Design a protein around this ligand. Structure first.
Ligand SMILES: *[C@@H](C)[C@H]1/C(=C/c2[nH]c(/C=C3N=C(/C=C4\NC(=O)C(CC)=C4C)C(C)=C\3CCC(=O)O)c(CCC(=O)O)c2C)NC(=O)[C@@H]1C
Ligand SMILES: *[C@@H](C)[C@H]1/C(=C/c2[nH]c(/C=C3N=C(/C=C4\NC(=O)C(CC)=C4C)C(C)=C\3CCC(=O)O)c(CCC(=O)O)c2C)NC(=O)[C@@H]1C
Ligand SMILES: *[C@H](C)[C@H]1/C(=C/c2[nH]c(/C=C3N=C(/C=C4\NC(=O)C(CC)=C4C)C(C)=C\3CCC(=O)O)c(CCC(=O)O)c2C)NC(=O)[C@@H]1C
Ligand SMILES: *[C@H](C)[C@H]1/C(=C/c2[nH]c(/C=C3N=C(/C=C4\NC(=O)C(CC)=C4C)C(C)=C\3CCC(=O)O)c(CCC(=O)O)c2C)NC(=O)[C@@H]1C
Ligand SMILES: *[C@H](C)[C@H]1/C(=C/c2[nH]c(/C=C3N=C(/C=C4\NC(=O)C(CC)=C4C)C(C)=C\3CCC(=O)O)c(CCC(=O)O)c2C)NC(=O)[C@@H]1C
Ligand SMILES: *[C@H](C)[C@H]1/C(=C/c2[nH]c(/C=C3N=C(/C=C4\NC(=O)C(CC)=C4C)C(C)=C\3CCC(=O)O)c(CCC(=O)O)c2C)NC(=O)[C@@H]1C
Ligand SMILES: *[C@H](C)[C@H]1/C(=C/c2[nH]c(/C=C3N=C(/C=C4\NC(=O)C(CC)=C4C)C(C)=C\3CCC(=O)O)c(CCC(=O)O)c2C)NC(=O)[C@@H]1C
Ligand SMILES: *[C@H](C)[C@H]1/C(=C/c2[nH]c(/C=C3N=C(/C=C4\NC(=O)C(CC)=C4C)C(C)=C\3CCC(=O)O)c(CCC(=O)O)c2C)NC(=O)[C@@H]1C
Ligand SMILES: *[C@H](C)[C@H]1/C(=C/c2[nH]c(/C=C3N=C(/C=C4\NC(=O)C(CC)=C4C)C(C)=C\3CCC(=O)O)c(CCC(=O)O)c2C)NC(=O)[C@@H]1C
Ligand SMILES: *[C@H](C)[C@H]1/C(=C/c2[nH]c(/C=C3N=C(/C=C4\NC(=O)C(CC)=C4C)C(C)=C\3CCC(=O)O)c(CCC(=O)O)c2C)NC(=O)[C@@H]1C
Ligand SMILES: *[C@H](C)[C@H]1/C(=C/c2[nH]c(/C=C3N=C(/C=C4\NC(=O)C(CC)=C4C)C(C)=C\3CCC(=O)O)c(CCC(=O)O)c2C)NC(=O)[C@@H]1C
Ligand SMILES: *[C@H](C)[C@H]1/C(=C/c2[nH]c(/C=C3N=C(/C=C4\NC(=O)C(CC)=C4C)C(C)=C\3CCC(=O)O)c(CCC(=O)O)c2C)NC(=O)[C@@H]1C
Lengths: 172, 266, 75, 162, 162, 172, 162, 172, 162
């Protein structure tokens, strides 16, 4: 597992040299924007149930064959498994946002997820579509300007979007 | 533990026990020994009849189809395990047997009793049993290839001290088994988060001299007492009485409303 | 390729009557298994047969220990 | 799925045993119950449309707010009513499957496992489906063994829901 | 104990579940079988002494050496014959217990478990007991469901011994 | 696992449709054969040891190379393993006869047996021949009109024959 | 009991190691947050009664059927209203505990664990409590860090119920 | 376990009442001295090895019968266990210092330790003497005025000494 | 590596939980410490060569036998001196990594784990490295939060060595 600091540390250790001034300055900039990252993490986890549920409902609306009998999301057990994956993907994206590195997302969630879905017959393209729906919902929530100290969060929104892209491309 | 405490506590064989690991390209006798070790420890040292053996599970273990952990799981889920540890036992006794057989330790907390009770109530015997084998504790101690062994007598990481003491309540000796429906010895100890004195091996015996009666046998009566006479100084009390005064001591404890927790030969 | 008789739990769930083979590589010494009593014997491709009902657990276990799930095949 | 025949085989296989007289008695009990189960399923599927429509209407009458307030989880619009009728049809169809199979296995497999977190996720109260199943209990018109077995499955769904 | 009622409750309790229609059908099969099983037990009980003596003689006839060669494991003396008659009486008595209980559970707990170690330690041929069981099966004089249940227990013991 | 009822239930649930009158009538006909099916299961079970032992002896009578030293059936452990396998195949065939569906024999015993026997060096052809011998013994015992209410058991015997062929074809 | 300090010790003790600088920063974060949490709990405590009655009224407004339908689970009488007000007060009080504790530990220990069983066996709709929690969010009048931490606890409860 | 906040929380929930103003101000006082608590934990941790080793050396000097052959500290295995028990007690004292509550120290370390030592034959009085030496040492590091901001740490020192007293009372 | 961010996420993941307020406080404490850790790392790397050279000389001064004793493990010749300076540089560089990361993780991953077998196999006394770390402590010139965190790492290494 890596965070934003430990990734630079590991690369420096492989080279066997101290962090340069530029890398230290880069991490200082990361710390200066750390408050936005925490607050963005908080806003996604505060609306996690709404994000997962709205994305899933929209997904079955545009892909009715998932919930038709014989569909992969049909029956309660498979439907519950589907929402659980939605929730798991969202949770690990928040982890990656919190740490600032994608290592937690790739090593603990997307590791073998593609071949999990292939082996189970799960339609990973529809999983990716649901993940993109979370992306639009979660990015709108993070970018909501009401009840918060105004600032620019463009960098963290792009980073969160990138984590969502990693998960959607992994399951596809 | 070291020898000097081990002989007193009767845990010499546990201390000198060597973990058994099924390595790759193991011979027939190694699989035989591994199967025997699993039966000994998962079934709590019972005389296993040949008709109660898991012939298909041990065939898959022999043919490298499954791991030692899978074979341990198959034995734990088997109807033989159910009959002798689940179907005639209370739930708290059953899960302490699970802790002894699968993780090699005594329960640490009453929350661990609260867990595996709700888990049974929601997900059945199979989910509850799989909790131990799929746990983090099972993975670092035994992994996929080491037969589980008792660990309660040794200092473990992320262990409570009570575990060592409570170990002697679930491990009664090398020549003992978990065969007779019986209630747990740890119920009150776990619920009220206490520790009981360890009386195992030679630890239970006490000096007799001329104070013991005609047959030179003292008995230790551990009781819970309150004021019902003379002043009571402690809630817990221990009484050492000869055989000839055992009935009288019992009857006067009874008429004071004191609860007897344990009687052992001392 | 045997195993489904003992790997699948005695619960008669049709979903649970499915086992899968996990191919895992690179089982390294990590900070997650510093206090492991047993030692890692192989870091190459190892095959773990996992029933459906435990696939959630096993992959987590693999992911904490640095193992890379390279392939998963129906049994 | 959990059925008398498969459970007998699964527990015999767990013990590595051939099928003894106990499993044969279980099959005899299954045979005794099977004709009523098949006849109950046929009777239920004959007026399944009327049963589902009446059950949906009973839920609407017992819970008028479901047809009035706006919301994804409510049947105010036609989409909600179609989703609701489809759910009742899901419940009734799986109940007929249970009657055919001889146990609550289809309900556990297809409906019961995971229903509560579906209901929590989509804000569907279990009380709605309980009223629907109560209507199905009160209006199926079955008698004898067929009535008792169908009601056991319907009460199983009700008890799982509540 | 391997009996349908204990089996049904064991499966339900292992699942932490109430008794569903699956368990009810198990009880129905047990009820459909019990009277025939009980009168098979009584028919076997009333003819038990003659059956055991006849079974013992059949073993002595098929294996004449058991009545001649000296040895603790043989029936050359009256002591060995009493042991043999007691063993066959044990087989018949626990078979009646199986008929009463409706399953092989009495045979498993009282006789089958560990019988291989017994016949090996005291060098008793299991083929002798198989011959005794075959005589009992051929001479119990039962019919129908009574015959079927009783023969299943006798053949269960025969298969266990071989 | 599937039995004869849950098999058509699973097919119907996948299509999301109720069982038609024809399917229920077929299940009713199955119930009408239930007594014969129980008789067949009971007869094979009561002669399981005889079937396995006679077939094994016949299988070693011809094909003597199995029991010569160096052969696969040589040594006590491998002979016990061979005998065990014959009994296991027979036991799962009885399970399939009892359930009226072949899922239990295939999923728990047959699937993966051929590759397992190839890896161990077990001759698949010879064990298939033993299964054929178990087939002939079991079918004679089931088709024994003595001591039973005589009737037409042709349908249940054909099903048993199909299960034995399934075992032999999957193992070869 | 999830709080920053207890979890730091739980992690360190699970690794059997002394508290390093990682756990010190955990305590530093708890220190930076504690005053805002304490002022949040005090502000909620002083305003608890109006918040509880207003939350109950908001739930009655959004779900009017709770106030005329007869039944043990509804608030059409004074007994139901008392139970409703008490439940919302439990929610409000345990949220203040979380603000004091610095984590969701009071919510997990006292309210969240088993709430699903309770709302189902007494057929209480979790949507009622979601609106009650939403009203408390909209009317607690907190600002800054106190508002952010209190809303996280209220949203934690909401996500648990939804 | 419990920390200083959750102890008040658990008591309040049992009473079923909100924390009063006095309890909230008491916890405000507690977080006002949080920095000194962190300093004391860090200072004991930084010299934990020296604390354990110096206390053991002093203990074996004052009680030579422990390291005398036949003693309970004789042999490397027992000496290693003894040093480990000293480090363990010190670690749990720091845990109780960190949380502000003694629950971790009691529940995990102290409960069952007297019975364990009596059963092992470990002299509880000698362990109690060792804990006093660690206590004496650890308060010297905690109260060392060099290289730290001036202030009054008498309250936290008394709390740490109370934890060490609990340890010594528990073992004997 | 062990750090407040990674440890918080690992604890949350082990419980399968979203990041609650406890984890946010952990991140806040890490942010409160991170700037001082970065200037601490900058000061140590700005003065790395003099610190390493002085640390080697201090080790040689306190343990003069390493300068004149012939052996693979001693620094009598230039090769031993290069190895000794390289080891101290390794210690200093990983401490800066720990300051950057905010935890003892780099020390545990890169240096602490296995250092005992290394010192034993190559006959390196840990007392030499303890003296080198003390020199770095006494001459790093750090003040405030920088010094505190840096000395925590250095004493972590010393306690691990001693
Ligand atoms: C082909 C399989 C053979 C065959 C079978 C056959 N059996 C019956 C009828 C019955 N058989 C039973 C069976 C049992 N009763 C018991 O108590 C037990 C032990 C648990 C068993 C196995 C029963 C209950 C019946 C019904 C009543 C009766 O005795 O008739 C039939 C008749 C038709 C029917 O299916 O009901 C048949 C055809 N007959 C043959 O000729 C084959 C060799
Ligand atoms: C009794 C314990 C001794 C004592 C303590 C004391 N410390 C402070 C102030 C601070 N100490 C810290 C601590 C740390 N900062 C870090 O980065 C690290 C490593 C993770 C630690 C351990 C902090 C942040 C402060 C506040 C800022 C400051 O530098 O002053 C005080 C002052 C009052 C306060 O509570 O802050 C005191 C009293 N002082 C003594 O005299 C005792 C020997
Ligand atoms: C929903 C959007 C889509 C969908 C989902 C779906 N997934 C499964 C099954 C599994 N998903 C996983 C993945 C994980 N489990 C974890 O613990 C983690 C984190 C480490 C991940 C990423 C696994 C392992 C399974 C199988 C095991 C289990 O479900 O317990 C299913 C069920 C598949 C089946 O047939 O049983 C489903 C339905 N399906 C869709 O159609 C959506 C597009
Ligand atoms: C035979 C001379 C007498 C007799 C014996 C008897 N013993 C048991 C049960 C057990 N025997 C042991 C003993 C050991 N197990 C070991 O591993 C060791 C070696 C260290 C010993 C000494 C144990 C532990 C048991 C418990 C049960 C088990 O199955 O292991 C029984 C069984 C009692 C029962 O089934 O309820 C019996 C019958 N009985 C007599 O009547 C003879 C005088
Ligand atoms: C009718 C009683 C009330 C009602 C119905 C309603 N249901 C949904 C949506 C879903 N229904 C289910 C249920 C199942 N799916 C299955 O596969 C099975 C088991 C085989 C069942 C019982 C599910 C999973 C959903 C969500 C996904 C989907 O839409 O298919 C809705 C829509 C809710 C939403 O958020 O879209 C509605 C309206 N609502 C009422 O008001 C009736 C009283
Ligand atoms: C006693 C508390 C009450 C009562 C019972 C009663 N029942 C019967 C008879 C039958 N009941 C059944 C039961 C079932 N058939 C099914 O299919 C199922 C569900 C799977 C069940 C539970 C059956 C099979 C019978 C026999 C046939 C029949 O219905 O007549 C009786 C009659 C006597 C008998 O033992 O058969 C009685 C008395 N009657 C009361 O008044 C009590 C309130
Ligand atoms: C009779 C068919 C042949 C025969 C018999 C014979 N048996 C024994 C000894 C024993 N028989 C048993 C068997 C059982 N005991 C039980 O409790 C049960 C289960 C309910 C069974 C089946 C046992 C345990 C013994 C040994 C102990 C004992 O003496 O009772 C003997 C004597 C062997 C000896 O060495 O004493 C004999 C002679 N002998 C024949 O020749 C017949 C063909
Ligand atoms: C006998 C007709 C033939 C024969 C058999 C033989 N088989 C093995 C080994 C194994 N057989 C199995 C198969 C199963 N085990 C089960 O539990 C089940 C149900 C799931 C099956 C189908 C397995 C797994 C093995 C390997 C483990 C073991 O050896 O026990 C052997 C032994 C091979 C060896 O010892 O290396 C033998 C001899 N051999 C013949 O020649 C016959 C044609
Ligand atoms: C109010 C929003 C709605 C409402 C309330 C209502 N609640 C109950 C009953 C119970 N409420 C609880 C909840 C808790 N108990 C606790 O200990 C805690 C955690 C600290 C909680 C959240 C429980 C357990 C019950 C049942 C036992 C009890 O009665 O106390 C009822 C009565 C239900 C019944 O059957 O008696 C009611 C009416 N009702 C409304 O209409 C509101 C919209
Ligand atoms: C980014 C997508 C949005 C945004 C964020 C933003 N936040 C701040 C500042 C702060 N946010 C916090 C966060 C919390 N305080 C708490 O108590 C908790 C709960 C435990 C949290 C999550 C804090 C502490 C600050 C600093 C103090 C302050 O309130 O200002 C900023 C300002 C810059 C900064 O980094 O401090 C920004 C930009 N702002 C937007 O406009 C986006 C929609
Ligand atoms: C040293 C000051 C004294 C001493 C110590 C000593 N202790 C043991 C053995 C054990 N110590 C413990 C204690 C714990 N284990 C834990 O996990 C925890 C933390 C929660 C504690 C407090 C236990 C349980 C044991 C026994 C198991 C084990 O040794 O691992 C010994 C060894 C005894 C023996 O005979 O081996 C010793 C020597 N002994 C002295 O003489 C000093 C006064
Ligand atoms: C200096 C304090 C004293 C000294 C040094 C010395 N060290 C070695 C050899 C090794 N040192 C290490 C250490 C590390 N390598 C790493 O990767 C890290 C962690 C990042 C550390 C701390 C190792 C592994 C070796 C052996 C392999 C190697 O040579 O690099 C030597 C040489 C010993 C030998 O046998 O060649 C020496 C001389 N010796 C003194 O006298 C100084 C006081």
């Amino acid at each position: 597992m890596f965070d934003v600091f430990t990734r630079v540390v590991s690369q420096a250790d492989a080279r066997g040299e101290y962090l340069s001034g530029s890398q230290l300055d880069a991490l200082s900039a990361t710390v200066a924007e750390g408050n936005k990252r925490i607050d963005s993490v908080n806003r996604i986890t505060g609306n996690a149930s709404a994000i997962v549920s709205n994305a899933a409902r929209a997904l079955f609306a545009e892909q009715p064959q998932l919930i038709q009998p014989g569909g992969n999301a049909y029956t309660s057990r498979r439907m519950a498994a589907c929402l659980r994956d939605m929730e798991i993907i969202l949770r690990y994206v928040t982890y990656a946002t919190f740490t600032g590195d994608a290592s937690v997302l790739e090593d603990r969630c997307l590791n073998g997820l593609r071949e999990t879905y292939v082996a189970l017959g799960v339609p990973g393209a529809s999983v990716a579509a649901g993940v993109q729906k979370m992306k639009e919902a979660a990015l709108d929530i993070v970018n909501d300007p009401n009840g918060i100290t105004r600032g620019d969060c463009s960098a963290i929104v792009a980073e969160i979007a990138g984590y969502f892209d990693r998960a959607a491309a992994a399951v596809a | 533990t070291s020898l000097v405490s081990a002989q007193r506590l009767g845990i010499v064989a546990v201390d000198e026990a060597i973990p058994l690991e099924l390595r790759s390209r193991s011979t027939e006798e190694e699989v035989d020994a591994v199967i025997l070790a699993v039966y000994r420890q998962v079934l709590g040292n019972d005389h296993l009849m040949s008709q109660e053996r898991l012939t298909s599970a041990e065939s898959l273990l022999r043919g490298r189809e499954i791991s030692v952990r899978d074979f341990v799981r198959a034995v734990a889920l088997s109807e033989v395990y159910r009959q002798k540890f689940f179907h005639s036992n209370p739930q708290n006794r059953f899960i302490e047997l699970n802790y002894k057989h699968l993780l090699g330790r005594a329960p640490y907390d009453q929350s661990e009793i609260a867990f595996h009770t709700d888990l049974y109530h929601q997900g059945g015997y199979e989910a509850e049993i799989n909790s131990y084998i799929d746990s983090v504790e099972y993975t670092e101690n035994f992994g996929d290839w080491v037969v589980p062994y008792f660990r309660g007598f040794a200092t473990q990481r992320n262990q409570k001290t009570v575990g060592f003491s409570r170990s002697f309540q679930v491990y009664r000796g090398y020549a003992t088994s978990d065969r007779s429906g019986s209630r747990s010895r740890l119920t009150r100890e776990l619920a009220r988060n206490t520790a009981s004195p360890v009386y195992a091996g030679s630890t239970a015996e006490s000096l007799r001299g001329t104070s013991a009666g005609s047959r030179n046998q003292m008995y230790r009566l551990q009781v819970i007492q309150g004021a019902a006479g003379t002043r009571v100084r402690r809630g817990k009390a221990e009484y050492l009485v000869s055989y000839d005064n055992l009935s009288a001591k019992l009857q006067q404890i009874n008429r004071q409303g004191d609860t007897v927790t344990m009687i052992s030969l001392a | 390729m045997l195993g489904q008789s003992s790997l699948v739990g005695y619960s008669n769930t049709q979903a649970a009557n499915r086992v899968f083979v996990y191919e895992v590589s690179g089982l390294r010494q990590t900070d997650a298994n510093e206090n492991s009593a047993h030692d890692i014997r192989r870091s190459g491709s190892v095959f773990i047969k996992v029933p459906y009902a435990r696939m959630n657990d096993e992959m987590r276990r693999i992911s904490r220990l640095g193992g890379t799930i390279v392939n998963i095949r129906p049994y | 799925m959990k059925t008398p025949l498969t459970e007998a085989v699964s527990t015999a296989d767990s013990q590595g045993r051939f099928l003894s007289s106990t499993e044969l008695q279980i099959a005899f009990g299954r045979l005794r119950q099977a004709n009523a189960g098949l006849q109950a399923a046929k009777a239920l599927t004959d007026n399944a449309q009327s049963l589902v429509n009446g059950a949906a209407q009973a839920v609407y009458n017992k819970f008028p707010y479901t047809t009035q307030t706006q919301g994804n989880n409510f049947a105010a619009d036609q989409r909600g009513k179609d989703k609701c009728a489809r759910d009742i049809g899901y419940y009734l169809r799986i109940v007929t499957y249970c009657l055919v199979a001889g146990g609550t296995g289809p309900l556990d497999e297809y409906l019961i496992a995971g229903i509560d977190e579906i209901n929590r996720t989509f804000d569907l109260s279990p009380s709605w489906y309980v009223e629907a199943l109560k209507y199905i209990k009160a209006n199926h018109g079955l008698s004898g063994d067929a009535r008792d077995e169908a009601n056991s499955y319907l009460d199983y769904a009700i008890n799982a829901l509540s």
